[PDB]
Design an enzyme around this catalytic site. Structure first.
Site, PDB file in Angstrom:
ATOM      1  N   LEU A  65       0.833  -1.209   0.000  1.00  0.00           N
ATOM      2  CA  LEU A  65       0.000   0.000   0.000  1.00  0.00           C
ATOM      3  C   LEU A  65       0.859   1.247   0.000  1.00  0.00           C
ATOM      4  CD1 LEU A  65      -3.128   0.953   0.455  1.00  0.00           C
ATOM      5  CD2 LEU A  65      -2.430   1.168   2.814  1.00  0.00           C
ATOM      6  N   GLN A 123       0.654  -5.565   1.355  1.00  0.00           N
ATOM      7  CA  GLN A 123      -0.338  -5.901   0.363  1.00  0.00           C
ATOM      8  C   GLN A 123       0.371  -6.584  -0.823  1.00  0.00           C
ATOM      9  OE1 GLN A 123      -4.030  -3.824  -2.185  1.00  0.00           O
ATOM     10  NE2 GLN A 123      -2.551  -2.586  -1.063  1.00  0.00           N
ATOM     11  N   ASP A 130      13.505   8.480  13.152  1.00  0.00           N
ATOM     12  CA  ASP A 130      12.512   7.864  12.260  1.00  0.00           C
ATOM     13  C   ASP A 130      11.142   8.118  12.824  1.00  0.00           C
ATOM     14  OD1 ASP A 130      10.887   6.217  10.758  1.00  0.00           O
ATOM     15  OD2 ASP A 130      12.166   4.446  10.858  1.00  0.00           O
ATOM     16  N   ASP A 185      10.228  -1.314   9.346  1.00  0.00           N
ATOM     17  CA  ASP A 185      11.558  -1.867   9.602  1.00  0.00           C
ATOM     18  C   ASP A 185      11.780  -3.061   8.644  1.00  0.00           C
ATOM     19  OD1 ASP A 185      12.141  -0.198  11.754  1.00  0.00           O
ATOM     20  OD2 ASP A 185      11.337  -1.556  13.226  1.00  0.00           O
ATOM     21  N   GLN A 224      13.195   0.763   6.443  1.00  0.00           N
ATOM     22  CA  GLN A 224      12.725   2.190   6.445  1.00  0.00           C
ATOM     23  C   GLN A 224      12.514   2.718   7.899  1.00  0.00           C
ATOM     24  OE1 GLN A 224      12.868   4.068   3.943  1.00  0.00           O
ATOM     25  NE2 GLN A 224      12.251   3.080   2.041  1.00  0.00           N
ATOM     26  N   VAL A 260      16.648   3.327   9.250  1.00  0.00           N
ATOM     27  CA  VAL A 260      16.608   3.414  10.742  1.00  0.00           C
ATOM     28  C   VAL A 260      15.679   2.428  11.418  1.00  0.00           C
ATOM     29  CG1 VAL A 260      16.165   4.998  12.668  1.00  0.00           C
ATOM     30  CG2 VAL A 260      17.203   5.879  10.486  1.00  0.00           C
ATOM     31  N   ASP A 282      18.750  -7.009  11.461  1.00  0.00           N
ATOM     32  CA  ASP A 282      19.065  -6.361  10.210  1.00  0.00           C
ATOM     33  C   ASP A 282      18.185  -6.939   9.099  1.00  0.00           C
ATOM     34  OD1 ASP A 282      20.174  -5.274   7.899  1.00  0.00           O
ATOM     35  OD2 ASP A 282      22.187  -5.909   8.298  1.00  0.00           O
TER      36      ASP A 282
END
Ligand SMILES: [Ca+2]
Length: 320
Positions: A17, A88, A242, A288, A292, A296, A303
């Site tokens: 989305l 999505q 973030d 995450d 993003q 961050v 990771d």
């Protein structure tokens, strides 16, 4: 550089989305992921679909992806692709795997609302409260323009209301009836299905993982609090650098109060189960999962780049 992620079939990353390959042609949806995989020998293509639309129907995101898949096959000379979807995107991937079984080698879904989102139910419930119905129209017109402006190609095929509806728990149940999969467990069971599916002579490897940063804690009569496990309590710099960190914590608290249980801010653990579930322990919120915003994440989060790289290698070793 090596062949650590050199899968037999090309990998296609499928956004969810609001997505596009590059926001305003500047910000990569799959932050630093395409570059990382290519460096390790993978052939990767990033799909650019409507950020706001349903997955099924003419002009839906499913038919857009199917068309893109065929374009990648023709250009690469490949016979199948490995689909990796986020949010999505995971639903769109299932659509292609169902309508064109022979062109798909595997489907991996990351934080995909297979059973819908309690948050979508909430937003939709709010909209319906306006007796005049004007709210829906105004908000729709605003989100739709937003999609056109952020789409790297300024795609005009945007329908914010269709998108919202597609993500509700009621609608997702119907999608599942229309596009069943051996990778899904029984409705309302919070269980996964089988690790593979044989769709007429074609075998698909099915995988999934979810982030469960948001955990419910104590409660009172009708009020459940949550905790963000991806971060060091209150002083984590991710809370500051973030903006999505606190935003998903908030959205995640609404989720918990709607009975979702563990979630990543918008998708519950139970809704994300599909195929071979690799993990539901990652301390990640919804963004995450795609590294993003701008890479961050809280100090307790794994990771995501490494996780995805490792999966490309598992695909290689599995023969796809
Ligand atoms: Ca983050």
């Amino acid at each position: 550089a090596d062949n650590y992620a050199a899968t037999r079939y090309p990998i296609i990353l499928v956004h969810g989305l609001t997505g596009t390959d590059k926001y305003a042609g500047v910000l990569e949806y799959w932050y630093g992921i395409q570059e990382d995989l290519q460096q390790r020998g993978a052939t990767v293509y990033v799909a650019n679909l409507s950020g706001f639309q349903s997955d099924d129907g003419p002009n839906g995101r499913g038919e857009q992806l199917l068309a893109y898949v065929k374009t990648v096959l023709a250009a690469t000379g490949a016979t199948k692709v490995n689909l990796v979807g986020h949010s999505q995107g995971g639903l769109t991937s299932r659509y292609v795997a169902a309508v064109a079984p022979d062109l798909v080698a595997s489907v991996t879904t990351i934080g995909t609302p297979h059973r819908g989102s309690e948050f979508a139910d909430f937003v939709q419930g709010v909209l319906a409260y306006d007796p005049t119905g004007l709210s829906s129209t105004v908000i729709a017109a605003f989100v739709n323009v937003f999609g056109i402006l952020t789409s790297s190609s300024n795609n005009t095929n945007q329908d914010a209301l269709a998108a919202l509806k597609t993500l509700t728990t009621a609608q997702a149940a119907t999608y599942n009836q229309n596009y069943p999969s051996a990778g899904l467990g029984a409705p309302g069971s919070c269980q996964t299905g089988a690790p593979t599916e044989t769709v007429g002579g074609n075998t698909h490897l099915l995988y999934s993982w979810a982030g469960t940063a948001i955990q419910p804690t104590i409660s009172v009569f009708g009020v459940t609090g949550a905790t963000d496990t991806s971060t060091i309590p209150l002083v984590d710099p991710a809370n500051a650098l973030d903006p999505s960190t606190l935003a998903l914590f908030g959205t995640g608290t609404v989720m918990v109060n709607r009975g979702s249980g563990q979630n990543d801010g918008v998708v519950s653990k139970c809704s994300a189960l599909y195929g071979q579930v690799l993990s539901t322990s990652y301390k990640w919120n919804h963004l995450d999962e795609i590294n993003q915003l701008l890479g961050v994440r809280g100090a307790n989060a794994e990771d995501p780049v490494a996780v995805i790289r490792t999966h490309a290698n598992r695909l290689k070793l599995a023969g796809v």
